[model samples]
Target: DTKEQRILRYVQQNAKPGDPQSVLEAIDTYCTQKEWAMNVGDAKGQIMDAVIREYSPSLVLELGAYCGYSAVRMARLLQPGARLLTMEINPDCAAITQQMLNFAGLQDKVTILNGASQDLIPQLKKKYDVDTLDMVFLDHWKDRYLPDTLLLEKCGLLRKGTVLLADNVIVPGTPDFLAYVRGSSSFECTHYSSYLEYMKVVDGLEKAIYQGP
Candidate 1:
């Protein structure tokens, strides 16, 4: 199996039901042992931490909940009463991610939704009465990034000064989304050009923090 496949298999085997922290631990183990190229890998995680601190968001939304690594990181930084709602398209990944969050002792602070972002955001808005999301972390399907942001805008989910942090903006480039942010008045962005974790030399990742309105 490829390294990525091996990492997934390890997560599948080690992730226990209802244990979020264990799942996160498994993800760390996978990265350490096999080096899966997940977005939340070590160096990228540092960037995420910085964004969270700068935004100081009261409510955060994550586009992907893979293995709950990022969820744990976000939960650790969030203030009391702050919450993170993370969406994942793969049901199995969701289950494992939930377990991982629990293991990290962050289940109460972070929610793992087993649905596509496009389908879940509407329901989430209604269920939580959350109209203005303070921060958004986009790390899911690259092509859907721009469309999903537009959807959030139309739904009134993002307010003025809301922060949107996008990962893998260079390596697995999101040219459309990058271009849109650059040309539009909707957002002012700070682009961080950095090398991917664990790679000696290759295409770098861009961490873009888009400030709304």
Candidate 2:
């Protein structure tokens, strides 16, 4: 079986049906104890949870949907009838995420778009019936982080109070994006100290909240 399929099998075998937390836990154990995949795991996820609680966003955009781990987390945290639109360029990865979402009983709360974030994000304006997003989470290519963020700015996808949360500011690091948000006054940015997903390495989330246009 493929690694993705193996994960599905493990999750199916171990997790209680319709139990999102159990499903998330099973995936975490499988990735940590058996193999490694990029799913934010648990450590940094706690920080994400707190942010979600504070934001309680009605509409969220995720730049990367890997294994649906963060998608499930966000789906569970969003307010009633809130929606999440996630982008994943890889078809297989997107498929895996769909399965994971279904397993977590969050399939109804998320919409998966299988394409490059840059290409897909533009359409989100018309597709979701609003130009502004309540929150955006960046977890895709480190290099694209800055440009995509700028694209969101140019596209007017971020409104006042919109929060942009990014992972691995120091893992591989995003120099320009870190500079853009941190240096700008229109953005209220903070660095939360943390470790890499499922690893004991220095990493953190760059949370930038848009003050206004």
Candidate 3:
């Protein structure tokens, strides 16, 4: 089976059923000891958890759903009536994320959408019933970061004070995305220093607050 499938199996085998934190631990443990996957990992996950707790956003959007690691992480912190909408470009990954969310008993809290952010951002309102997003997590292809941010703005998905949290901005850098958020008057940006997932290499997340047009 693929690594993604193996991760689901590992979670199913080791994590306490319906426990999202245990599922996260299982994936982190497996990725740390056995193989390195592209999960956000425990460290960065803490950062995400902090953001979720601080914002307490009722409607959140995640640009990437890699194995549902971050999705589970975020969904675990969501308060009642809050929901996480995560998109995965790869159908196989989307299916795996759906299962992972289901295993965590977070199926009701998170929705896994299979499509590119470019195509889905515009549909979020009418198609998915999203109003203005309170927070957005970016962890998909680095190249798509800049374009998708533009798309979100053009599509009116972002509102004043909406937080845009971007992952992997250092190891596999997104210079253009960083430049836009850091330079643009439309966003107020901050840098969070951390290491790469399950490694000592330098990496970080960029938190950009939308200031509106």
List the candidates' TM-scores in order: 0.84, 0.96, 0.99
Error of 2 at 160 (Å): 0.6
CA-only RMSD, every prediction: 3.7, 1.1, 0.7
Can you rank all candidates by lDDT, best first? 3, 2, 1
Q: What clash count does candidate 3 reach? A: 0
lDDT of 1: 0.75
lDDT of 2 at 107: 89
**Model 3 over residues 27-122: C-alpha lDDT tens digits?**
999999988999998888888888889999999999989899999999999999999999999999999999999999999999899998888889
Weakest lDDT window of 10 consecutive positions for candidate 1: 200-209
Question: How well is each residue in 70-144 modelled by candidate 1, as lDDT tens digits?
Answer: 887778789998999999998877876776666556788887888889988878678877878888888899898
The per-prediction tally of clashing pairs is: 11, 0, 0
Candidate 3 TM-score versus the reference = 0.99
lDDT of each: 0.75, 0.89, 0.93
Among all candidates shown, the one with the greatest lDDT: 3
Per-residue lDDT for 35 in model 1?
67
Candidate 2 — number of clashing residue pairs? 0
Candidate 2 wrong stretches, greater than 4 Å: none
